[PDB]
Scaffold this active site. Structure first.
Site, PDB file in Angstrom:
ATOM      1  N   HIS A  12      -4.381   1.469  -6.639  1.00 22.22           N
ATOM      2  CA  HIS A  12      -4.888   1.243  -5.277  1.00 22.22           C
ATOM      3  C   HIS A  12      -6.376   0.833  -5.144  1.00 22.22           C
ATOM      4  O   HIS A  12      -6.906   0.823  -4.020  1.00 22.22           O
ATOM      5  CB  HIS A  12      -4.665   2.519  -4.462  1.00 22.22           C
ATOM      6  N   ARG A  20      -7.285 -13.091  -1.333  1.00 17.09           N
ATOM      7  CA  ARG A  20      -6.280 -12.061  -1.370  1.00 17.09           C
ATOM      8  C   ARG A  20      -4.989 -12.640  -0.848  1.00 17.09           C
ATOM      9  O   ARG A  20      -4.481 -12.210   0.190  1.00 17.09           O
ATOM     10  CB  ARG A  20      -6.738 -10.865  -0.546  1.00 17.09           C
ATOM     11  N   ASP A  21      -4.465 -13.613  -1.595  1.00 15.53           N
ATOM     12  CA  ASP A  21      -3.270 -14.373  -1.201  1.00 15.53           C
ATOM     13  C   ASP A  21      -2.015 -13.883  -1.953  1.00 15.53           C
ATOM     14  O   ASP A  21      -2.103 -12.925  -2.724  1.00 15.53           O
ATOM     15  CB  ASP A  21      -3.526 -15.889  -1.427  1.00 15.53           C
ATOM     16  N   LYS A  39       7.575  -2.597  -7.363  1.00  9.89           N
ATOM     17  CA  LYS A  39       7.205  -1.691  -6.291  1.00  9.89           C
ATOM     18  C   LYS A  39       7.374  -2.419  -4.962  1.00  9.89           C
ATOM     19  O   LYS A  39       6.948  -3.572  -4.825  1.00  9.89           O
ATOM     20  CB  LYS A  39       5.777  -1.216  -6.513  1.00  9.89           C
ATOM     21  N   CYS A  80       0.433  -5.726  -0.650  1.00  7.36           N
ATOM     22  CA  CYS A  80       1.393  -6.567  -1.323  1.00  7.36           C
ATOM     23  C   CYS A  80       2.784  -6.028  -1.026  1.00  7.36           C
ATOM     24  O   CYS A  80       3.082  -4.884  -1.374  1.00  7.36           O
ATOM     25  CB  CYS A  80       1.136  -6.574  -2.835  1.00  7.36           C
ATOM     26  N   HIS A 113      -3.634  10.131  -4.093  1.00  6.95           N
ATOM     27  CA  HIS A 113      -2.470   9.566  -3.419  1.00  6.95           C
ATOM     28  C   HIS A 113      -2.974   8.701  -2.267  1.00  6.95           C
ATOM     29  O   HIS A 113      -3.923   9.082  -1.574  1.00  6.95           O
ATOM     30  CB  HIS A 113      -1.614  10.705  -2.885  1.00  6.95           C
TER      31      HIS A 113
END
EC number: 3.1.27.-
Length: 120
Positions: A12, A20-21, A39, A80, A113
């Site tokens: 993360h 950020r494509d 994921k 994503c 987390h």
């Protein structure tokens, strides 16, 4: 034991993305080992680590729901999201760049987390 903090960063944290494509997502998800199986949703926080760790203190966080914490500051983020029918690679991702506060869980002053629900 700081293994969960380390894992949090792996899953993360990405300090300095440019674009950020979709291709950014498809590459970083591979690079961080999140593609066996694919994921379904994953969000990266950008900027410095110290702002993220600060969510665990009064400095940049409030308590939230059951034993979570919500940041006071807003972060550049990229989410994503998996698309296509299959759980297995190749994993195609749609990128959504964003700017807002984040929810984490903290243990011994370190984030361990990320709550993905706020990016769904």
């Amino acid at each position: 034991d700081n293994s969960r903090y380390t894992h949090f960063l792996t899953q993360h944290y990405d300090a300095k993305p440019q674009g950020r494509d979709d291709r950014y997502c498809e590459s970083i998800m591979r690079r961080r080992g999140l593609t066996s199986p694919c994921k379904d949703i994953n969000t990266f926080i950008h900027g410095n680590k110290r702002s993220i760790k600060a969510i665990c203190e009064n400095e940049n966080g409030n308590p939230h729901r059951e034993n979570l914490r919500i940041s006071k500051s807003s972060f550049q983020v990229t989410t994503c999201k998996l698309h296509g029918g299959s759980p297995w690679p190749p994993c195609q991702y749609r990128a959504t760049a964003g700017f807002r506060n984040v929810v984490v869980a903290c243990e011994n002053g370190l984030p361990v987390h990320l709550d993905q629900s706020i990016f769904r």
